[PDB]
Swiss-Prot record:
Record's protein name: Talin-1
Chain spans, region Helical bundle R3: 501-625
UniProt-annotated location(s): Cell projection, Ruffle membrane; Cytoplasm, Cytoskeleton; Cell surface; Cell junction, Focal adhesion
Species of provenance: Mus musculus (Mouse)
Function per UniProt: High molecular weight cytoskeletal protein concentrated at regions of cell-matrix and cell-cell contacts. Involved in connections of major cytoskeletal structures to the plasma membrane. With KANK1 co-organize the assembly of cortical microtubule stabilizing complexes (CMSCs) positioned to control microtubule-actin crosstalk at focal adhesions (FAs) rims.
Residues of the full protein shown: 208 to 2138 of 2541
Region (Helical bundle R2): 370-500
Phosphothreonine sites (modified residues): T856, T977, T1569
Length: 1852
């Protein structure tokens, strides 16, 4: 039947060629073969070539352009010329068999999983099937049957499909034809189913608020009841140091009490503001965020008052009025909440009246405290001004009401009625809010509420004016506006008057204050704007007149003053400025002459500095004093916004009490700050007392600078706690407090630095002042010691005083090393910092010493430690006063010696003071017993009586196990009471001397007497190892609970067990024949104790490492037992013992590797938390010190032989070089700037000593001269002193070893490994003894029976332990946990997506759309902050991976929950669908990462096929967060809200301060080339913002976003720029300018958005413009500090920008040359242009020569060189356009090449400039320098080509 076959043929051709049928190109090539077989017939090979075959009508139009024409031709030969009807049947059957038959196809964009991307998929629809088919292959990738669909959907652009059953997840694909697909699939599934056919009710939100206030109210009264009872207070007595604590807690409470009453007032306003909205519109959660704030801070007030009140009662003051104040406040708070409940329907006045009481009530409470900053008179101003604003309100009410009579239209009548009514409540609302906020106007948050209410009345006023417009063209409008204008003016009066009290250090100002302040602001520009000549002089102008006004004013003042003596000093000081002013004036004129001389800018500055000082010389001291009140009001501000967050954790985080997750790292973090505040506020009150004493100002600076780092960690922790918290009300109360604290820190870091430069230098006598004050204080204590009644402080115990006193001395000893390192470096300003540390520790030590005495009992015991404490003070006091005395002249050799001589004494003093403590005792006895034993051990050990040479020496080893037993006691005693540890040491002490006596007696018993020197050295090595082990025990005696110290004692015990082995190997006798077996038995005893409790890390090598280390040790122990066993049968003793030593080394390694396997698994438990591993490894550092000093100790004895001489160099140079590297790695990871300088300096001292010593050891090589040996002895001292110094530096407690915390259940998972490990030694231990006897007798059945019995038990422990190790596999349990938790989070979205697709997603009514995004944001921010630490763990270490993933999961359900809501509120359906989709991608990628991490498992052995997957996974998600974070920020900008923008700044300021500084990629130049370019953007943007304010204010949103984003970039490169700059001063300035730019933008952007919510306000449109100038100025400063880079130059950059601008100017000439407009003027000749060019051109090349020759040199000359270059080109640019015009545009093409010539020449100049920029501060043979000459020649060749070019166009 050919007719139907031909019709099938034709219709299949239709279906395929139009593209309606997906067919791959190859299959389409067979189709085209059929085509030619039929319509071209049997094709001829010769004639059927390309050229006559039309592809478009011969192939599907999608594959016609694939142009495989000859490929299609061999497809024709493939089909050949075979029969046409069989060609027809092959055509039809090849079309049929393809799975894409019988099914329509659609191009639908599908979303790849893992990216916010879209790819085509030709989705296939079948009568029975749903199939996804790839676009390219045209082949099925996946298949579904119809019967599984359950609910499809239609969207204007989407077609969502679901299955639910087979894959957990649905099929969402967008397409413009979703409607037709939906109806078609509906019909298809209908057919498939028919085949198998047979107002009192509250809004749901209000319930939540109702409970929260109910929950709060219950907490309220409970707090209220506790008030009435004066509970207690610890007894402290009359001690002056105690009395200080009595004073401090009171004052601390005074600040503690204030912050909450500051919070309570602020919260109440938030209720008042937010409730005023229409119900069904308000943010109840915010009210919850308010009421919880009201309640949570209500109760910490209750704790505070009682503590204060009790303190008041020991004083004569009666606490009764205080409590009466508290209870009065308490009820007022409560009575408010009664009107807060949405159920109660009281009139609105009740709420407003209730709040006013709170402010009224909270007023007198502060009046009882006396802690109110605001003036009482100022409150009345607010009181009346509010009424004054209220007064104008009444006026507009009447006039608007007057319009009501004028009004005529129904409804439009009441609209004006409505508007006026709204104002009346609004202003009354303003009246109440102002009353509420009255007593706490100081805090910012109170102020930020007041303006909102002030904004609210302003908008309502504008509404009334709009309402008045509804009337008809009468004077009522004019008189209405005249009423409105007063109301807005009154509001402005209320707010500016409001802002005045915001920053007021003191009320009175003096006389010259307004003059004084002016110079500061402008001097500040002068210091800031280094590197820009124009700015400095420009300010120098405005300064010089301004200070002259002071000069004039004081001059008239002296005239007015009548006393001649004072009239002198007024004038006398006045002259000092006059000299100072002119000195600046002339210097200013000097730098003006030389713009680019970096010394002149230094000159202009340095005059300005004394200029400030000269104002201090004048009677007003404000230049210095004012900069303190900008700190005293900063510290209190941060101190409050700390104690308002500290409480905001206790209440809110108590709800879960979850031991996993982020909470337990929060409360621990909050601990540090909670004790830092009392050190801060106590300082602030110190400055408030004597502002005229520079010591206090340094203290306030000292405290504030320290505060930041402990404080900062809270914020980066709290922002990581926000999502997990479940009770939304207590959640938001945390984030808002964290953001406030976040700001109040960046405004501390700034205001601190100002104080640092302004404040006078430490002069390292404030330390002398403090120690002398301390000297007298403890003298009173020593005087009060005989008084016999000294009571301890509240918080310390005998076991607690020591662990700091023990720590304190190690700090001071470390501190003193700082001082010496600095003084040798020469009288730095850090040298003053060192005196601070030494003083600072001395305050700690003295305070600790006072603590012990007050707690210890016996007065004679008491008195002695104070003496050695007092001895430390006086001895160290001599050092400090000597340090400054020796600081006068650097480079004096006796100075370092006289310093060190005293500096040795202070260390000698401290060690005495530590031991003088009687608590730890009698260890001194043991060490001295060892030490005194060393003296007779050091000298000529000779046997007075031989006894038995062989037997008594053998008898010695029979006593050897006792000393080994003696040591193993100590480590056991390390787990008991400190008194108990004395016993084992005491028994060890007697054990050492007793065993040493038998040691020394038979030491000289050996025949050879050269062996006598060996055996004493053998006893030496045992001595020091034991001695230092006791020295290790000396440490633990003062710090019991610290596990890091306990590990060091175990390591020291390992020192002796090897050291005792050192004797037995060679010197002792093998008469028993098994001496190595005891070495096995002794080591087996010692290794056991190390495994006994692995609380702290035993090694650095990680888990999978210790798995292999165990794995290899398993095999060797398998081999070793074979080795010893068979030799026992052979009875061959020497080879029998050989495998023993390897076995023990296998055992010692194995148990260490097994102990590490314990600690690792122990940490991985989710509850536990790890440590930071420190900087200097206590294990490796200690022996590194030991080995080096052991080496030089050997050369100390007179007899130097190449046997010991050459070995000494090898052990020294191998270790001392390594010891240097330890500092260098640590120094780059430190955060203390002092440590960086000190580590480098000290590490080089050994290197200098190394060079001196290595020369001498080479000088002694082959000479052996006594002086050559003596000069080796002399050169020993520098290295030993240097290493001891550096070691003394490292014992600072802050540097290393925070002990990781292990959960109980964390210990649970550890025991299975521990138990099996323990018994293996037990099985081994009994197996060891079997070997010794069996070496003698070849066989004995019971002995050889237990030999196997233990060995399998040895084996069973080994296999069972390994079984646990591989099966436990840390990191692959919680990954499964997270994945499931993650995978469900995906499911919700996929359904929630579907619900919105058909428009069913119901908007949750509790929350406003703005708040959802904020949560949806802080959720996302945390995720991206954890990406890299997770990608780190998945590579190297598993223990950390255990905790990280569990953190990256818990952020998701709080996100997805928010995301479903987030898209629910949004109205435009395309927005909500995408808002979810990008979120859906985020989890999807995150899941992909988690899979790889599981496979990564923290395994170093996984190959690149797995390793690459990790990295390529991170990138898919890292850019995913970037995709989402925009979609929120941007959507948070269209709306007027500005949050996050005001946060990403206040954070990228703090991120700028802390971290590692190690010079990542890039020079200081290639930073400065981009960083400046970025700096321009935030400049071009603010001027792009000013214009929009007048023109079209609705666009301020995205601009403010584009601002704060770029300031992110300028923040990122800043610190790497600072570190890579040559001079620290250049670096620090590039930072500090960026920061002082930060506070500018935050103020800018907050206004910027606020305008968008009042687009036609007039007074906010002012402060925008004024602030917009402030940032633009600051950019000029940070640009100026960027010009302080002598490396590279703005001359390099600006020229390139300018010459490109000249190219753009040439392009404008090119536009005219192209347009032909550029015509000739008059009869201008050409030689004028040519010759003018001729000079410039040859001037350019000479300028080029001076330019190129300056690639190495001072910035100044190359600056003019570039400035000459820019001059040459622009002068050339002037003449060329004149020259080009000289031909006229009648011959434009002649002009074109000419202007194109310079267009190319100027380009070459820029390339030369760009090469010049890259070629600066270079070596003579740098790869760029030849690149310079090439570019130089490029200029040379182009200009000559230019010269000829014009020379040839002179004619036609």
């Amino acid at each position: 039947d050919p007719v139907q076959l031909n019709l099938l043929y034709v219709q299949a051709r239709d279906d395929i060629l139009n593209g309606s049928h997906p067919v791959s190109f190859d299959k389409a090539c067979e189709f085209a073969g059929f085509q030619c077989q039929i319509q071209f017939g049997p094709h001829n090979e010769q004639k059927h070539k390309a050229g006559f075959l039309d592809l478009k009508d011969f192939l599907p139009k999608e594959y016609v352009k694939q142009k495989g024409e000859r490929k299609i031709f061999q497809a024709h030969k493939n089909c050949g010329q075979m029969s046409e009807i069989e060609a027809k049947v092959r055509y039809v059957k090849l079309a049929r068999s393809l799975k894409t038959y019988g099914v329509s196809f659609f191009l639908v964009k599908e979303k790849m999983k893992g990216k916010n991307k879209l790819v085509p998929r030709l989705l296939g629809i079948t009568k029975e099937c749903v199939m996804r088919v790839d676009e390219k292959t045209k082949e099925v990738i996946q298949e579904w049957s119809l019967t599984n669909i359950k609910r499809w959907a239609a969207s204007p652009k989407s077609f969502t499909l679901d299955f639910g059953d087979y894959q957990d997840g649905y099929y969402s694909v967008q397409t413009t034809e979703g409607e037709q697909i939906a109806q078609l699939i509906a019909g298809y599934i209908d057919i498939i189913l028919k085949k198998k056919k047979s107002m009192p009710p509250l809004t749901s939100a209000q319930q939540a608020l109702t409970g929260t206030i109910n929950s709060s109210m219950q907490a309220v009264q409970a707090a209220q009841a506790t008030l009435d009872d004066f509970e207690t207070l610890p007894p402290l007595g009359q001690d002056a140091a105690s009395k200080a604590w009595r004073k401090n807690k009171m004052d601390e409470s005074k600040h503690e009490i204030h912050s909450q009453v500051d919070a309570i007032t602020a919260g109440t306003a938030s209720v008042v503001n937010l409730t005023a909205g229409d119900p069904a519109e308000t943010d109840y959660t915010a009210v919850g965020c308010a009421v919880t704030t009201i309640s949570s801070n209500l109760t910490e007030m209750s704790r505070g008052v009682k503590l204060l009140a009790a303190l008041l009662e020991d004083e004569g003051g009666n606490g009764r009025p205080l409590l009466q104040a508290a209870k009065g406040l308490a009820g007022a708070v409560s009575e408010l909440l009664r009107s807060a409940q949405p159920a109660s329907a009281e009139p609105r006045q009740n709420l407003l009246l209730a709040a006013g009481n709170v402010g009224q009530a909270s007023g007198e409470l502060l009046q009882q405290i006396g802690e109110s900053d605001t003036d009482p008179h100022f409150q009345d101003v607010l009181m009346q001004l509010a009424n004054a604003v209220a007064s104008a309100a009444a006026a507009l009410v009447l006039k608007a009401k007057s319009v009501a009579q004028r009004t005529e239209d129904s409804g439009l009548q009441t609209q004006v009625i409505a508007a006026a009514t709204q104002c009346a409540l609004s202003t009354s609302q303003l009246v109440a809010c102002t009353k509420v906020v009255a007593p706490t106007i100081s805090s910012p948050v109170c102020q930020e509420q007041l303006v909102e209410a002030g904004r609210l009345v302003a908008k309502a006023v504008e509404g009334c004016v709009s309402a008045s417009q509804a009337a008809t063209e009468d004077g009522q409008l004019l008189r209405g506006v005249g009423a409105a204008a007063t109301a807005v003016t009154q509001a402005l009066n209320e707010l500016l008057q409001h802002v005045k009290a915001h920053a007021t250090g003191a009320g009175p100002a003096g006389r010259y204050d307004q003059a004084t302040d002016t110079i500061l602001t402008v001097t500040e520009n002068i210091f800031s704007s280094m590197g820009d000549a124009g700015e400095m002089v420009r300010q120098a102008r405005i300064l010089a007149q301004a200070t002259s006004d002071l000069v004039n004013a004081i001059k008239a003042d002296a005239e007015g003053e009548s006393d001649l003596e004072n009239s002198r000093k007024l004038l006398s000081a006045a002259k000092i400025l006059a000299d100072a002013t002119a000195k600046m004036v002339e210097a200013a004129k000097g730098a003006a002459a030389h713009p680019d001389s970096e010394e002149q800018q230094q000159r202009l500055r340095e005059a300005a500095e004394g200029l400030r000082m000269a104002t201090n010389a004048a009677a007003q001291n404000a230049i210095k004093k004012k900069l303190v009140q900008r700190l005293e009001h900063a510290a209190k501000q941060a101190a409050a916004s700390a104690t308002q967050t500290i409480a905001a954790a206790q209440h809110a985080a108590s709800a879960p009490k979850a031991s996993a997750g982020p909470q337990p790292l929060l409360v621990q973090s909050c601990k540090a700050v909670a004790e830092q505040i009392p050190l801060l506020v106590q300082g602030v009150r110190g400055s408030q007392a004597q502002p005229d004493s520079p010591s206090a100002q340094l203290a306030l600076i000292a405290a504030s600078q320290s505060f930041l780092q402990p404080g900062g960690k809270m914020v980066a922790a709290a922002k990581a706690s926000v999502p997990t918290i479940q009770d939304q009300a207590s959640a938001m109360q945390l984030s808002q407090c964290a953001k406030n604290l976040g700001t109040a820190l960046a405004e501390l870091r700034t205001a601190a630095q100002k104080a640092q430069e302004a404040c006078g230098p430490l002069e390292m006598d404030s330390a002398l002042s403090v120690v002398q004050n301390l000297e007298k204080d403890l003298q009173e204590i020593k005087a009060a010691a005989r008084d016999g009644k000294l009571k301890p402080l509240p918080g310390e115990t005998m076991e607690k005083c020591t662990q700091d006193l023990g720590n304190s001395t190690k700090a001071v000893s470390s501190a003193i090393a700082k001082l010496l390192g600095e003084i040798a470096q020469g009288n730095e300003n850090y040298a003053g910092i060192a005196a601070r540390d030494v003083a600072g520790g001395l305050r700690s030590l003295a305070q600790a010493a006072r603590g012990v005495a007050a707690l210890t009992s016996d007065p004679a015991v008491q008195a002695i430690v104070l003496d050695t404490a007092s001895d430390v003070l006086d001895k160290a006091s001599s050092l400090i006063e000597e340090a400054k005395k020796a600081s006068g002249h650097p480079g004096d050799p006796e100075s370092q010696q006289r310093l060190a001589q005293v500096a040795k004494a202070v260390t000698q003093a401290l060690n005495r003071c530590v031991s003088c403590l009687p608590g730890q005792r009698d260890v001194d006895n043991a060490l001295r017993a060892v030490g005194d034993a060393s003296k007779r051990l050091l000298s000529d050990l000779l046997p007075p009586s031989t006894g038995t040479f062989q037997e008594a020496q053998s008898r010695l080893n029979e006593a050897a196990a006792g000393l080994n037993q003696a040591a193993t006691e100590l480590v056991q005693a390390s787990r008991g009471t400190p008194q108990d540890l004395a016993r084992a040491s005491g028994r060890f002490g007697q054990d050492f001397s007793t065993f040493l006596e038998a040691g020394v007696e038979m030491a000289g018993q050996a025949p050879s007497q050269e062996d006598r020197a060996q055996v004493v050295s053998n006893l030496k090595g045992i001595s020091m190892s034991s001695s230092k082990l006791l020295l290790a025990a000396k440490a633990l005696s003062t710090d019991p609970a610290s596990p890091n110290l306990k590990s060091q004692l175990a390591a020291a015990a390992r020192a002796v067990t090897d050291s005792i082995n050192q004797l037995i190997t060679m010197c002792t006798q093998q008469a028993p024949g098994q001496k190595e077996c005891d070495n096995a038995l002794r080591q087996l005893e010692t290794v056991r104790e190390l495994l006994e409790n692995p609380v702290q890390p035993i090694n650095d090598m990680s888990y999978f490492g210790c798995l292999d280390s165990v794995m290899e040790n398993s095999k060797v122990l398998g081999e070793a037992m074979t080795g010893i066993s068979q030799n026992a049968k052979n009875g061959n003793l020497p080879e029998f013992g050989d495998a023993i030593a390897t076995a023990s080394k296998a055992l010692c390694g194995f148990t260490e590797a097994a102990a590490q396997a314990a600690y690792l698994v122990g940490v991985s438990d989710p509850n536990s938390q790890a440590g930071q591993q420190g900087l200097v490894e206590p294990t490796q550092f200690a022996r590194a010190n030991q080995a080096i000093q052991m080496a030089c100790q050997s050369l100390g004895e007179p007899g130097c032989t190449q046997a010991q001489v050459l070995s000494a160099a090898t052990i020294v140079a191998k270790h001392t070089s390594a010891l240097c590297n330890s500092c260098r790695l640590a120094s780059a990871r430190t955060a203390n700037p002092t440590a960086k300088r000190q580590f480098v300096q000290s590490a080089k001292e050994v290197a200098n000593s190394t060079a001196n010593l290595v020369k001498t050891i080479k000088a002694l090589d082959g000479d052996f001269t006594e002086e050559n040996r003596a000069q080796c002895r002399a050169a020993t001292a520098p290295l030993l002193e240097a290493v001891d110094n550096l070691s003394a530096f490292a014992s600072n407690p802050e540097f290393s070893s925070v002990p990781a915390q292990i959960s109980p259940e964390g210990r649970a998972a550890m025991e299975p490994i521990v138990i099996s490990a323990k018994t293996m030694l037990e099985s081994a231990g009994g197996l060891i003894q079997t070997a010794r006897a069996l070496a003698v007798n070849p066989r004995d059945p019971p002995r050889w029976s237990v030999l196997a019995g233990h060995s399998r038990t040895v084996s069973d422990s080994i296999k069972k332990l390994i079984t646990s190790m591989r099966d436990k596999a840390p990191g692959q349990l919680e990954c499964e946990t997270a994945i499931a938790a993650l995978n469900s989070c995906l499911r919700d979205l996929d359904q929630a997506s579907l619900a919105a697709v058909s428009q069913q997603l119901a908007p949750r009514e509790g929350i406003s759309q703005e708040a959802l995004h904020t949560q949806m944001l802080t959720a996302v921010q945390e995720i991206s902050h954890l990406i890299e630490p997770l990608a780190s763990a998945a590579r190297a270490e598993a223990s950390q991976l255990g905790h990280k993933v569990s953190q990256m999961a818990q952020y998701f359900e709080p996100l997805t929950l928010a995301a479903v809501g987030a898209a629910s509120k949004t109205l435009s359906h395309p927005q909500q669908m995408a808002l979810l989709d990008q979120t859906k991608t985020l989890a999807e990628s995150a899941l992909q990462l988690l899979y790889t991490a599981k496979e990564a498992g923290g395994n170093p052995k996984q190959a690149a096929h797995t390793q690459e997957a990790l990295e390529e996974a991170v990138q898919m998600m890292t850019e995913a967060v970037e995709d989402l974070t925009t979609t929120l920020n941007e959507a948070a900008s269209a709306a007027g809200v500005v949050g996050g923008m005001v946060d990403s700044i206040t954070q990228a300021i703090n991120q700028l301060d802390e971290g590692p500084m190690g010079d990542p990629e890039g020079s200081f130049v290639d930073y400065q080339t981009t960083m400046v370019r970025t700096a321009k953007a935030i400049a071009v943007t603010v001027q792009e913002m000013v214009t929009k304010s007048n023109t079209s204010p609705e666009e301020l949103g995205p601009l403010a976003n584009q601002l704060t984003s770029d300031y992110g970039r300028l923040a990122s490169q800043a610190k790497p720029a600072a570190v890579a700059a040559e001079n620290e001063e250049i670096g620090a300035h590039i930072k500090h300018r960026v920061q002082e730019l930060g506070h500018g933008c935050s103020a800018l952007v907050t206004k910027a958005g606020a305008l968008q919510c009042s687009p036609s306000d007039v007074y906010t449109k002012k402060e925008l413009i004024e602030c917009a100038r402030r940032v633009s100025e600051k950019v000029s400063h940070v640009l100026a500090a960027l010009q302080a880079g002598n490396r590279g130059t703005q001359a390099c950059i600006t020229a390139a920008s300018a010459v490109s601008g000249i190219i753009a100017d040439l392009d404008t000439t090119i536009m005219f040359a192209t347009a032909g407009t550029l015509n000739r003027e008059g009869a201008e000749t050409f030689a004028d242009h040519r010759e003018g060019i001729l000079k410039t051109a040859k001037v350019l090349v000479e300028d080029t020569k001076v330019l190129v020759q300056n690639a190495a040199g001072s910035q100044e000359k190359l600056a003019q060189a570039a400035q000459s270059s820019v001059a040459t080109i622009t002068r050339l640019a002037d003449v060329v356009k004149l020259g080009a015009a000289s031909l006229g545009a009648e011959d434009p093409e002649t002009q074109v090449v000419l202007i194109n010539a310079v267009k190319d020449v100027a380009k070459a100049l820029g390339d030369l400039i760009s090469a010049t920029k890259a070629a600066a501060g270079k070596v003579g043979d740098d790869p760029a320098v030849w690149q310079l000459k090439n570019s130089a020649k490029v200029m040379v060749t182009n200009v000559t080509s230019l010269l000829k070019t014009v020379k040839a166009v002179e004619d036609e």
